[PDB]
Structures are given as C-alpha cells and as structure tokens.
C-alpha cells in the first residue's frame with residue numbers, strides 16, 4: 140500500500156525520554172520510518188519553547204492534502220539548522236521515539252509510504 144493508517148500517541152515535550160531519532164537528516168528520516176512501522180513513534184505538537192527542548196535533526200509530519208476516515212494525509216519532512224528536506228503543508232507536529240510515555244491524545248494520520 141502507498142498509504143498506511145496510523146494512530147500516533149501525542150506526548151508532552153517534558154515527558155519525552157528520547158528526544159530525536161539520530162544525528163543526520165538521512166538517519167532521522169530512516170529511524171522515524173522504522174519506528175512508525177514498529178508502532179514505537181510518538182508525536183509532539185510544535186509550540187513556543189518545544190523545538191529547543193528536542194534534538195536536531197527534527198522529523199515533522201506535515202499536511203500533504205485536505206482526510207479519509209478521520210485520518211489526515213501527511214508526509215515526513217526532516218529539518219537541520221533551518222533547512223528542510225522535503226516540501227509540504229502545515230506541521231501537525233514533530234516525531235520522536237515512543238518508549239512507554241503516557242499520551243495526552245491520539246492523532247489519526249494517513250502516511251505516504
């Protein structure tokens with residue numbers, strides 16, 4: 140399938156134990172994709188103060204289209220020192236490893252795979 144339906148647990152930035160996927164744009168995009176498959180990927184919503192508390196490179200999910208079955212269509216866009224690798228819509232948040240943190244909510248997304 141080109142698209143996959145996922146329910147991503149939304150985590151509080153201060154609860155997050157592992158604050159990024161790695162050290163290169165190519166690595167964070169690979170680890171992000173792997174965690175999304177193993178269902179070990181969380182989502183932190185981007186506000187004032189949130190990105191400085193997380194490790195670059197960032198991986199964002201951004202809106203790719205305007206929502207089958209309640210699931211918003213999104214795609215992966217890494218960012219490193221102000222440059223993004225990818226081009227897409229509004230940020231739904233930043234992806235992080237999930238290692239058992241209690242979510243505040245769930246975000247239903249359709250991921251281009």
Ligand SMILES: CC1(Sc2ccccc2C(=O)O)CCC1
Nearest residue numbers: 143172173175176177250251252
């Ligand atoms: C990481 C995809 S692939 C995927 C994701 C979750 C569950 C199953 C699969 C699969 O390929 O079968 C979404 C990012 C590319």
